[PDB]
Design a protein around this ligand. Structure first.
Ligand SMILES: CC(=O)N[C@H]1[C@H]2O[C@@](C(=O)O)(C[C@@H]1O)O[C@@H]2[C@H](O)CO
Length: 485
């Protein structure tokens, strides 16, 4: 029993733990949020994680019951206390599928909300993903590949075609199997079933055990008769009613480079270009262990099709989580985490198709492993200039000393990528410098206030794992944030 929160232990998600905030004010004034619902403590995948979603209809002041738009059912969703001793803390659920690391984006022209998450097959996370796309080509077309249970481990002789029908690719003929819009498996039109797993500890032993509860068998599960290639996928659903209902699951990572180990989202929000030649383009940040590290996916047709862009030729596989802001002419500036001990910035003057080399951002102190950041546009001038805001920790030694910065944009007299300069004029301290501060997401609320949803602890530290109710929500008026310390 415990003593502000959107997601919390005992809410409708049935998770005791959350990480990875996303916060987005919609054009209508509705405000939405999403996070990982991390059931098996605060571990990254491999684990049991669902994506939670919540909505405010009073301008982001109060919040409704969360829902779970992206969820798997192979393992039960329940409230469990994860152990925090020196042995048990390291224990992770081994055999569950998961959705991890959300991105929210609105297309303001169509009023469609998109929710993206990484989609991890059972027992997979980024660190143990196999190299490959997960797709094969049958006569020039890309289809999701499948492994049948009685074939050799390395053999994916089956494909999900545009039908939903599973085909044998050696004979090119349709099987009796198919998937529905959630990638659940059917034979002869009958739902195929498997037993759901529970998870319970005995001392520091984690027991993952079948129950008697039947669930839909899914190609992402450990127990399935057909199974996907064990790499990372990008999932998306869209909503035309501000998150009351969602579309079928879309696997959008058809473009995943064959040489990549993982290709995942930079969590937070995406961006729709407001100004210039590429107004209307939807763009979402990504990163990879591949030919490239930073990347993006964009759509010019309101979300139906997505093009992958590599932003560099970095083979590091660092956690290059990025967020994007727009300059007054429509050019883009992306701020990113790196594995080099600074936040980097890259620019694009062609709507995100090409990007400048990284420039360190000197104003902010970070660790060698880095932390996600949040950057947003602000709709009103500050000190007569277009303004952006940035939220991140400010410390070389841990994730702590959270700040909200305000950056004012000027023309430099130069051209191209050098057209604009940002003066980080204002720096507001969220709390005492010692207080933990990890991932965060900013949004501009419909009254011009700034909302912040953030991890109020150090989510890297091996000594702060599995803390409950650390995702805190605060609201500020802009005058409060205008502090020059
Ligand atoms: C897909 C995935 O695993 N994303 C993770 C990664 O970023 C975080 C992090 O806190 O830094 C949390 C994210 O949910 O931890 C991971 C890091 O790569 C090494 O721990």
């Amino acid at each position: 029993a415990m003593a502000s929160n959107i997601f919390y232990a005992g809410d409708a998600t049935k998770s005791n733990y959350f990480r990875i905030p996303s916060l987005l004010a919609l054009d209508s004034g509705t405000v939405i949020a999403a996070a990982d619902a991390r059931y098996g403590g605060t571990h990254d995948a491999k684990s049991k994680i669902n994506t939670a979603f919540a909505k405010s209809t009073d301008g982001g002041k109060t919040w409704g019951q969360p829902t779970l738009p992206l969820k798997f059912d192979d393992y039960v969703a329940k409230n469990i206390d994860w152990p925090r001793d020196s042995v048990g803390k390291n224990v992770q659920i081994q055999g569950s599928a998961s959705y991890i690391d959300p991105v929210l984006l609105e297309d303001k022209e169509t009023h469609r909300v998109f929710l993206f998450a990484d989609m991890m097959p059972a027992g997979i996370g980024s660190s143990n993903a196999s190299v490959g796309s997960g797709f094969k080509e049958v006569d020039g077309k890309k289809y999701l590949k499948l492994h049948w249970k009685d074939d050799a481990a390395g053999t994916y002789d089956y494909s999900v075609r545009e039908n939903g029908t599973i085909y044998n690719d050696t004979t090119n003929s349709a099987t009796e199997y198919s998937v529905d819009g959630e990638y659940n498996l059917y034979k002869n039109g009958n739902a195929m079933l498997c037993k759901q797993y529970d998870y319970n500890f005995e001392g520091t032993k984690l027991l993952e055990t079948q129950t008697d509860t039947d669930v839909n068998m899914n190609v992402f599960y450990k127990d399935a008769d057909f199974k996907v290639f064990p790499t990372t996928y990008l999932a998306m659903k869209y909503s035309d009613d501000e998150g009351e209902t969602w579309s079928d699951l879309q696997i959008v990572s058809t473009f995943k480079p064959e040489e990549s180990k993982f290709l995942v989202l930079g969590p937070g929000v995406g961006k729709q270009i407001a100004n210039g030649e590429h107004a209307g383009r939807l763009i979402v940040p990504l990163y990879s262990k591949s030919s490239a590290e930073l990347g993006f996916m964009y759509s010019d047709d309101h979300g139906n099709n997505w093009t992958y862009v590599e932003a560099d030729q970095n083979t590091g596989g660092a956690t290059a989580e990025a967020q994007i802001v727009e300059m007054p002419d429509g050019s883009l500036k992306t701020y990113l985490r790196t594995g080099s001990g600074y936040i980097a910035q890259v620019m694009s003057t062609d709507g995100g198709e090409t990007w400048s080399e990284r420039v360190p951002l000197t104003e902010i102190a970070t660790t060698g492993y880095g932390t996600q950041l949040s950057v947003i546009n602000y709709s009103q001038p500050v000190d007569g200039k277009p303004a952006i805001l940035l939220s991140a920790p400010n410390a070389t030694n841990g994730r702590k000393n959270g700040k909200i910065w305000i950056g004012l944009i000027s023309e430099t007299g130069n051209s191209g990528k050098d057209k604009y300069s940002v003066d980080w004029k204002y720096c507001y301290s969220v709390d005492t410098p010692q207080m933990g501060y990890s991932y965060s997401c900013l949004t501009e609320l419909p009254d011009g206030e700034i909302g912040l949803l953030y991890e109020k602890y150090d989510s890297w530290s091996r000594n702060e794992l599995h803390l409950k109710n650390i995702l805190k929500y605060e609201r500020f008026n802009i005058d409060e944030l205008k502090v020059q310390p």
